Design a protein around this ligand. Structure first.
Ligand SMILES: O=C(O)CCCC[C@@H]1SC[C@@H]2NC(=O)N[C@@H]21
Ligand SMILES: O=C(O)CCCC[C@@H]1SC[C@@H]2NC(=O)N[C@@H]21
Ligand SMILES: O=C(O)CCCC[C@@H]1SC[C@@H]2NC(=O)N[C@@H]21
Ligand SMILES: O=C(O)CCCC[C@@H]1SC[C@@H]2NC(=O)N[C@@H]21
Lengths: 120, 121, 121, 120
């Protein structure tokens, strides 16, 4: 299932609980960037996916402020969970930093992360 | 926080009602004017609760999974952006809408776009 | 084609000069108002030369590599979007700006945004 | 170098020539979507990359019209070439379909393709 401890290709750790009615709640620890230790995350997932082989849509957010650091930024991940022997969460993400209006054009990074439950 | 909290409408005519908590939480409901959607959907997200004071926006994001007690689109949108405060407050965003797909169709699972929200009263 | 061909300016104040060829080619120059850029840069792209006639936009895209004979930013932007014709013609786009990075920094190589171009005369 | 025949994770074939001063010219054949046979592509790349280990920035466009089909759409790929024993081109892409104004919100797909010169 979605609940568990996940790792992406960068070595970041995503610990999440999927509530029965669609909540995602957990913590995120990034291996890269202006980040240290765990950050709060919240999100949502489709708690009644299609029964045709399709993945389960989901998304979550981290604001990059915790007791250690504040990067004045937030990332959202949007993607789908694909169950099976080697379960996967495939995502695309948007990292927005707070900027002035004149620099808003360069406020948002985009990328893609794939998660599995295999520990580095 | 008082800044973010409130009712907002985007260029499509969608409605965003949000509460910003002291801990960095965003909670509320979203009603989309378009797509496979009807009525209100739960949203949850996070914002920078101690932002820069140097004329920068406040970073934030939130998610809606497009399932409520009336419809299920088997999809989820995330919005990533910044709140720009002041008397004409704005939330400027980019978003990713992922649909659940089969593996063969995963290449076409995700739409991208941008929404600008205006605060109402 | 006559529609796309011309001079266009975006919300940043950047300048796009383009010629649309009968074969679907776009050629021209781009001058950015912002970033690690000065003067004009070559652009090349493609457009749908036989678009739908049913009130839909004309799909198109183009690339600028941010090297000219005056500066090199070691980066490239692609714009993907549609031309909306008529007396107030627009090109509405989303873009991806990739910088060359080391492998360890590749996760932060790409910016995303959106530009709207207005045709001038 | 960039010039050559490349394949992505979907099995699409990208045949390209990198001109000395920054042009990319070639053809693209997609394994998926509303597409058959080869399509014209053009793009640009950094013809004098940094000498610090960094990749070479590049991008290209395909409009999905050829003598067989017209999907009334265009894709742009933005990314970097990474040389070495197993050269790679890592990209993110935007696929815009012509739409009415009211449907423009759903006009643009986003994804990511990785290319190598290894034939399936
Ligand atoms: O530098 C920052 O502003 C905060 C840390 C951002 C790290 C990002 S989020 C997207 C990507 N996936 C990760 O696991 N880490 C980076
Ligand atoms: O069609 C779906 O799968 C569900 C509805 C998605 C509607 C989206 S979310 C991004 C954009 N902004 C809105 O206010 N509505 C659309
Ligand atoms: O800073 C760079 O690496 C080169 C200049 C990039 C400027 C970009 S491209 C997308 C956006 N639209 C513009 O008109 N300018 C910026
Ligand atoms: O369906 C269409 O509108 C035309 C074909 C699009 C296929 C795309 S482009 C991005 C992705 N990478 C590929 O190799 N194929 C798909």
């Amino acid at each position: 299932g979605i609940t568990g401890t996940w790792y992406n290709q960068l070595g970041s750790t995503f610990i999440v609980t999927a509530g029965a009615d669609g909540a995602l709640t957990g913590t995120y620890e990034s291996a890269v960037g202006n980040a240290e230790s765990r950050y709060v995350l919240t999100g949502r997932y489709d708690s009644a996916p299609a029964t045709d082989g399709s993945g389960t849509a989901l998304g979550w957010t981290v604001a990059w402020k915790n007791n250690y650091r504040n990067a004045h930024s937030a990332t959202t991940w949007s993607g789908q969970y694909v169950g099976g022997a080697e379960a996967r969460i495939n995502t695309q993400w948007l990292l927005t930093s707070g900027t002035t209006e004149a620099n808003a054009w360069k406020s948002t990074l985009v990328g893609h992360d794939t998660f599995t439950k295999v520990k580095p």
